[PDB]
Ligand binder design. Structure first.
Ligand code: CHL
Ligand code: CLA
Ligand code: CLA
Ligand code: CLA
Ligand code: CLA
Ligand code: CLA
Ligand code: CLA
Ligand SMILES: CCCCCCCCCCCCCCCCCC(=O)OC[C@H](CO[C@@H]1O[C@H](CO)[C@H](O)[C@H](O)[C@H]1O)OC(=O)CCCCCCCCCCCCCCCCC
Ligand SMILES: CC1=C[C@H](O)CC(C)(C)[C@H]1/C=C/C(C)=C/C=C/C(C)=C/C=C/C=C(C)/C=C/C=C(C)/C=C/C1=C(C)C[C@H](O)CC1(C)C
Ligand SMILES: CC1=C[C@H](O)CC(C)(C)[C@H]1/C=C/C(C)=C/C=C/C(C)=C/C=C/C=C(C)/C=C/C=C(C)/C=C/C1=C(C)C[C@H](O)CC1(C)C
Ligand SMILES: CC1=C(/C=C/C(C)=C/C=C/C(C)=C/C=C/C=C(C)/C=C/C=C(C)/C=C/C2=C(C)CCCC2(C)C)C(C)(C)CCC1
Lengths: 148, 218, 74, 40, 89, 220, 226
């Protein structure tokens, strides 16, 4: 949380800097602003589509394994830190056996193999009372391809 | 020659710049209504700087292995030096990795701020006293190519403008290949997990069974 | 018709002189206060860029920059 | 700085300062001398 | 494309889809940079603003080799998964 | 300094207009235009000629007492030289409350005269204090020359030596101010006080850096 | 025209060719300021003359007395004759004032050329000091400068530049192998490939510190030891 807070403050300083820079320094001309076809093309794919795909990355690598371990009863201060799921394939493979294959199923169009972190269960998790994190990951993945 | 070029790109691409193949699909080098760091001058200046850095890296991310495996010494892969501590760290360093970074930051400040001040305010590093080096920090009009008794210390070139122009095309091409290589080193490292040299010495063995497609699963 | 980045180098200067002149944005409120209404007016007319000038180039630059700050405070 | 100080003198800024000092003074007074119901 | 799937129905379907869709633009059977369309789905030609310079005899530009093959890739994926879900594959 | 072509802070960047080069140790360094006002310059110059001078004396002490404590000579380190028992006096024993009050009282008198002359030049030189006049005058802002403040007569002597001496004072004072932040920051990270920190760095120079001290670099 | 340091280079103007050994080698433009060129030259000459004496001592001492390692010969016990275990502080005292006089006198010849030329104690006894850094007279007894001193100066600077480079070799190849200048030549000629800088640069062979008569003196290898 502390690291995130610091990052948000850094972003804040970038935003105000950008506002001053794009006003007192590099101020866009009207012809730039009136390219609606470009704005929509970049806000739909680059902003919404990539924004969801980037989240479908976190949800699949950090939120899903951590939440599974938390719901399994594991103490929060004993769960492997997020990065270990990315680097140590064994840990992620144990939680989701489909990481034993790799990205091969995706390119081979055998997406089905990934039916342990991308599912259409529907309903609510019986342990935490909230939508399955697996279903949310699949949603953001789909929503992305659509926007892109 | 021209690669994926368009009439619009040619309007602002007339061949002068070293290594101009008219390849500007998005069109960022268009001078008309430009500013900030997207000004054509800064873009070309950065490309040269990237080429020089990439060429040093491209030759540095494979040399510890090509030499270390041969038995010269060291024998580390570019990710196991301390750049990315989670992926490994070398043990025999005369100082702390962060301590080295502290010196690195101070050194780059006196080397990349002086370089910059010579672009913003051309030939401004030759007036303020700098241990007498200032004289060698004058540079020429072109920001990318300084010159002087230091940067061009062996006056390579100067025998005709044609030789300078060929030596500048050699660099922009030996550097666009090095830039594509550095990206290759990182990408292969992430997927395979091994070093550039071992990745080559594996394609050479069973090429069909040792490629990106097979590396998707293996 | 070409979609390209178009920018004007260093248009507005960065100074506090305008900061010390409340109402510099409106021709009417630049003449200073004579009634206590001006106080409430300089606030009820500070974000109405369209009222400040007729140029749609400036009004847009102001809107685009404003959004930035909003993001910053968010 | 002459014009920055002019801005820091405008009513909204001066009032923000004066009040903050007055508020902090009362807060600090109760912080060291709490529950001041009577002048004793 | 991995694990030497080459030859697999999936490989054949994807290759066929990508090719059938690139030969639907190089052969003027669909909209392309230049020769666009209309409110009645008829190619009424088009002026591109960048003026892409293509060496291809028909004028097929890189923009059009990355815009028809992508359609083939989406079509192939839809067909592969569809037949896969059914008994067809 | 003391020149139109004086060495500057960021070689290349032009110097501020208010910073002409006359002021001692002028290197045209005012990025946030803090001294844009001429009156502000005079006040800021005086303030610097006040913080640096005290800082210089303070640095001389933290170094002399420290050198003593390292050689063995009974000397409490700067950090613990306040809890040290106050010495007695022929008049009586010292009390912390009285000590603070006396220190402020005396300072108020001197500060008043100094600031009053700063606001009204020559105001103190009115023979009001026991007839002392010119000695209470100020040669320059932050330069109260006389036969009580410059006894040897560096200011009254060669101006070139005086000017050179003025540069020495500014540069040394700025260094002392930076040094003082060190003495404090090295203490609030190492907990040892200088001359022990110089001794540790000269015994294992490579493994005794700021990076390896726990507080400086948190992760490392 | 003089032959320059590289077949493609052009001499810096300030290096017109007056100074001996002018091969136009100033890549960092350090000698651009005429005051600095003057000073740096005197430093070159002093460094050369000191290294030529040094490279002769290391080689010579080894040839004659071979038991004492050049690196370890400044130790009081290592000192020969009665000098063995002589108070180093008292020795420093002599080496101090005596060196201070000769150096300061030489420095005043830089500050005011041809000013400190006459014997301060006695009188009349003076040194020609035709060029700064070339006093001659008592300094040139057998009288060889009377000929083409410039040609001799060129040989002197060129020999000195080789020596300066050679003495820093003796220093490194000694803190790596642990053996003297000619012993490292012998080892190479015994097994060339196996006695190279490859099998010797990975070890800093030489004490980390030396206690001299109660004064510990820390020591270091130029390259960080592997
Ligand atoms: C002007 C700068 C200045 C600085 C940087 C320090 C710094 C310090 N003083 Mg200190 N002092 C300074 C001025 C003065 N002190 C004192 C009187 C004392 C005492 C009596 C003591 C310290 C102590 C200390 C140390 C512990 C602080 C503490 O526990 O709070 C207590 C702080 C104070 C009582 C005064 C701090 C003033 C600032 C600390 C390093 C303590 C010490 O020795 O640490 C072991 C301690 O007991 N100072 C006086 C006279 C009244 C000062 C000036 O006139
Ligand atoms: C940091 C240095 C700086 C300086 C010296 C200036 C100076 C100037 N700016 Mg400017 N600006 C800056 C930064 C700066 N700006 C940044 C970072 C942005 C991006 C947001 C902008 C965006 C901007 C726009 C869009 C405009 C100016 C304009 C101006 C000129 C007159 C208006 C003015 O600023 O008066 C002083 C104004 C204020 C003091 C208002 C402060 C508003 C700030 C941005 C945030 C306040 C929000 C507040 C916290 C909301 C919550 C309140 C609640 C807690 C009660 C003036 C010369 C105007 C102009 O060009 O002249 C016509 C103009 O339209 N600026
Ligand atoms: C993939 C391309 C892309 C992306 C991702 C975006 C994204 C965004 N645009 Mg945008 N835009 C684009 C292309 C793109 N744009 C093009 C090509 C044009 C010209 C036709 C425009 C013209 C345009 C205008 C006029 C405006 C936006 C605005 C916005 C923001 C919406 C406000 C918001 O919800 O804040 C949410 C904040 C976030 C989601 C955090 C992300 C913020 C990052 C830093 C923005 C970076 C976008 C930029 C393209 C990246 C390059 C920056 C680099 C040069 C340093 C949003 C973050 C609005 C805005 O500026 O709001 C302040 C707005 O006024 N855009
Ligand atoms: C809605 C947000 C937004 C938008 C629409 C723009 C738009 C623009 N900016 Mg800008 N900028 C923004 C935010 C934004 N900026 C912020 C927050 C900062 C502070 C860091 C800056 C700082 C900045 C500078 C210094 C400059 C610009 C410039 C430009 C113009 C050309 C460069 C460009 O963006 O083209 C396309 C993008 C590029 C050419 C390079 C992209 C580099 C980005 C930073 C990499 C990643 C971007 C992406 C959003 C990251 C996604 C997340 C990541 C983990 C994948 C252009 C019109 C340039 C200009 O003024 O032109 C005259 C310029 O000099 N911007
Ligand atoms: C150009 C980058 C570079 C860098 C950063 C290093 C760095 C290093 N090398 Mg090395 N080396 C390099 C290039 C480089 N080398 C090249 C191109 C060669 C082929 C001639 C060698 C051949 C080499 C050998 C044979 C050895 C090292 C060794 C070492 C390590 C100790 C160096 C030392 O103290 O002895 C002095 C420096 C060197 C011997 C070579 C470095 C000189 C380079 C060119 C620039 C300095 C060190 C971390 C030693 C080692 O492996 O430690 C056990 C060792 O035995 N290097
Ligand atoms: C040989 C050709 C072929 C075959 C046999 C199939 C067969 C199938 N497809 Mg498919 N598809 C194909 C080509 C093919 N497809 C191509 C070329 C594309 C690219 C455009 C797609 C894109 C596609 C998508 C996006 C989806 C399918 C889905 C499906 C399955 C259920 C369809 C359904 O009833 O949706 C449902 C019918 C409805 C009325 C519900 C939709 C209503 C919402 C609100 C709109 C089914 C087994 C669906 C699926 O995967 O099911 C698991 C689905 O998500 N296909
Ligand atoms: C401390 C020794 C020393 C000093 C003071 C000088 C001084 C000078 N040399 Mg010189 N030189 C030296 C050693 C030295 N040299 C050696 C050993 C060689 C043999 C390679 C040469 C070969 C040489 C040539 C060919 C020429 C000069 C020239 C000059 C003059 C040019 C002005 C200049 O750039 O000055 C600055 C020089 C210095 C301040 C010397 C200090 C060295 C710098 C600060 C760092 C060097 C570190 C070095 C690489 C370490 C080597 C280690 C290695 C031996 C293992 C100048 C007065 C030019 C000339 O003759 O003009 C009349 C010229 O043509 N020198
Ligand atoms: C808080 C300090 C802000 C900077 C300051 O006060 O001076 C800031 C000084 C003076 O600040 C203003 O400057 C403007 C002109 O550039 C105004 O018109 C006035 O001259 C002045 O008040 O200017 C700067 O150096 C810019 C600093 C930006 C931060
Ligand atoms: C033309 C165009 C036009 C249109 O319009 C648009 C567009 C498209 C955008 C454009 C394009 C662009 C591009 C292509 C780009 C690319 C880039 C890159 C890749 C870079 C690299 C880059 C890369 C680089 C620099 C590199 C670097 C590196 C370095 C320094 C170093 C490293 C290393 C080594 C030695 C070894 C050690 O042990 C470690 C380290 C230290 C780690
Ligand atoms: C010119 C130039 C120009 C540009 O600008 C830049 C540049 C390039 C940088 C430059 C260069 C420079 C250089 C090269 C330098 C070098 C130096 C040296 C090496 C010295 C040595 C040096 C060296 C030396 C002195 C030596 C010394 C020694 C001695 C005394 C002695 C010793 C010894 C002996 C006898 C024996 C005994 O038992 C012991 C002892 C005692 C121990
Ligand atoms: C005959 C001819 C030629 C050839 C050319 C070519 C080679 C073409 C091809 C081209 C191509 C090569 C095409 C393809 C394309 C494709 C692509 C570019 C892809 C895309 C992708 C996308 C669009 C996305 C997808 C997705 C994902 C990723 C996720 C999930 C969902 C989906 C599936 C949707 C040449 C010149 C040689 C010679 C002369 C004539």
């Amino acid at each position: 949380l502390y690291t995130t807070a610091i990052g948000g403050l850094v972003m804040a300083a970038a935003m105000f800097f950008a506002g001053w820079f794009h006003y007192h320094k590099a101020a866009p001309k009207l012809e730039w602003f009136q390219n609606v076809e470009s704005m929509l093309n970049h806000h739909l794919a680059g902003l919404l589509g990539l924004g969801s795909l980037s989240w479908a990355g976190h949800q699949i690598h950090v939120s899903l394994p951590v939440n599974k371990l938390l719901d399994a009863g594991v103490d929060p201060k004993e769960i492997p830190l997020p990065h270990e799921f990315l680097l140590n394939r064994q840990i992620m493979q144990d939680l989701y056996p489909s990481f034993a294959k790799g990205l091969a199923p995706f390119f081979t169009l055998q997406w089905g193999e990934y039916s342990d972190f991308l599912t259409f269960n529907g309903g609510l998790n019986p342990v935490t009372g909230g939508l399955w994190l697996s279903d949310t990951a699949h949603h953001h993945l789909a929503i992305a391809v659509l926007f892109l | 020659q021209l690669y994926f070029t368009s009439e619009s790109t040619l309007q602002y691409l007339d061949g002068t710049l070293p290594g101009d193949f008219g390849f500007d699909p998005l069109g960022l080098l268009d001078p008309v209504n430009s500013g900030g760091f997207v000004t054509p001058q800064w873009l070309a200046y950065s490309e040269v700087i990237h080429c020089r850095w990439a060429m040093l890296g491209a030759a540095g991310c494979i040399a510890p292995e090509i030499l270390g495996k041969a038995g010269v010494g060291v024998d580390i892969r570019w990710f196991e030096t301390g750049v990315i501590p989670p992926a490994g760290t070398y043990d025999k360093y005369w100082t702390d990795p962060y301590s080295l970074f502290f010196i690195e930051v101070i050194a780059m400040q006196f080397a990349e701020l002086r370089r910059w001040q010579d672009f913003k305010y051309p030939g401004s590093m030759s007036k303020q006293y700098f241990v007498g080096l200032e004289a060698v920090q004058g540079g020429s009009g072109d920001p990318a190519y300084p010159g002087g008794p230091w940067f061009n210390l062996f006056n390579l070139g100067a025998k005709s403008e044609a030789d300078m122009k060929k030596l500048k095309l050699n660099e922009i091409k030996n550097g666009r290949l090095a830039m594509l290589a550095v990206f290759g080193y990182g990408a292969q490292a992430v997927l395979t997990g091994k070093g550039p040299y071992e990745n080559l010495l594996d394609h050479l063995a069973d090429p069909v069974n040792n490629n990106i497609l097979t590396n998707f699963g293996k | 018709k070409k979609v390209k980045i178009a920018v004007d180098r260093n248009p507005v200067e960065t100074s506090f002189e305008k900061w010390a002149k409340p109402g510099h944005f409106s021709r009417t409120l630049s003449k200073g206060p004579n009634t206590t209404t001006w106080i409430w007016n300089l606030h009820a007319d500070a974000h109405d860029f369209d009222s400040h000038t007729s140029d749609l180039e400036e009004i847009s630059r102001k809107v685009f920059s404003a959004h930035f700050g909003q993001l910053g405070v968010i | 700085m002459k014009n920055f100080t002019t801005y820091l003198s405008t009513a909204p800024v001066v009032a923000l300062a004066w009040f903050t000092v007055t508020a902090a003074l009362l807060i600090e007074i109760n912080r060291f001398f709490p529950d001041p119901l009577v002048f004793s | 494309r991995a694990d030497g799937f080459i030859g697999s129905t999936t490989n054949l379907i994807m290759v066929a889809s990508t090719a059938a869709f690139l030969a639907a633009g190089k052969f003027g059977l669909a909209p392309t940079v230049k020769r666009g369309t209309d409110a009645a789905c008829k190619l009424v030609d088009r002026p591109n603003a960048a003026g892409l310079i293509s060496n291809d005899p028909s004028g097929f530009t890189a923009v059009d080799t990355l815009a028809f093959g992508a359609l083939g890739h989406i079509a192939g994926v839809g067909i592969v998964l569809g037949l896969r879900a059914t008994g067809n594959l | 300094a003391y020149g139109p072509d004086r060495p500057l802070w960021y070689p290349g960047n032009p110097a501020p207009a208010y910073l002409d080069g006359t002021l001692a140790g002028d290197y045209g360094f005012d990025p946030l235009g803090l001294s844009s006002d001429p009156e502000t310059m005079r006040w800021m110059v005086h303030a610097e000629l006040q913080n640096a001078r005290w800082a210089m004396l303070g640095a001389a002490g933290v170094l002399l007492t420290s050198i003593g404590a390292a050689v063995g000579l009974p000397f409490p380190e700067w950090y613990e030289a306040g809890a040290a028992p106050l010495p007695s006096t022929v008049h009586g024993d010292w009390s912390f409350g009285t000590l603070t009050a006396t220190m402020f009282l005396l300072f108020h008198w001197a500060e008043q005269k100094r600031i009053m002359d700063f606001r009204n030049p020559g105001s103190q030189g009115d023979g009001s204090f026991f007839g002392i006049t010119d000695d209470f005058k100020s040669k320059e802002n932050g330069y109260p020359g006389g036969r009580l403040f410059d006894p040897i007569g560096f200011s009254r002597g060669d101006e070139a030596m005086y000017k050179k001496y003025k540069q020495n004072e500014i540069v040394n004072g700025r260094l002392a101010m930076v040094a003082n932040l060190g003495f404090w920051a090295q203490y609030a990270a190492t907990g040892k006080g200088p001359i022990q920190n110089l001794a540790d760095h000269l015994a294992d120079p490579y493994h005794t850096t700021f990076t390896t001290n726990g507080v400086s670099v948190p992760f490392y | 025209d003089r032959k320059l340091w590289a077949p493609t280079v052009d001499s810096p103007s300030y290096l017109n060719g007056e100074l001996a050994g002018d091969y136009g080698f100033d890549p960092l433009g350090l000698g651009a300021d005429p005051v600095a060129l003057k000073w740096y030259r005197q430093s070159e000459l002093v460094h050369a003359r000191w290294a030529m004496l040094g490279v002769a001592g290391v080689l010579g001492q080894e040839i004659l007395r071979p038991d004492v390692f050049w690196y370890e010969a400044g130790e009081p016990q290592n000192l020969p004759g009665p000098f063995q275990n002589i108070n180093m502080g008292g020795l420093l005292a002599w080496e101090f004032l005596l060196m201070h006089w000769v150096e300061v006198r030489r420095w005043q010849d830089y500050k005011n050329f041809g000013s400190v030329n006459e014997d301060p104690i006695f009188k009349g006894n003076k040194v020609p000091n035709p060029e700064m850094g070339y006093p001659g007279g008592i300094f040139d007894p057998l009288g060889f400068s009377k000929g083409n001193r410039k040609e001799l100066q060129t040989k002197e600077i060129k020999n000195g530049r080789i020596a300066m480079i050679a003495f820093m070799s003796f220093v490194v190849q000694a803190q790596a192998t642990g053996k003297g200048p000619l012993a490292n030549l012998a080892d190479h000629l015994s097994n060339p490939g196996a006695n190279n800088w490859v099998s010797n640069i990975n070890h800093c062979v030489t004490p980390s510190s030396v206690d001299v008569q109660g004064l510990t003196i820390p020591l270091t290898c130029l390259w960080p030891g592997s």
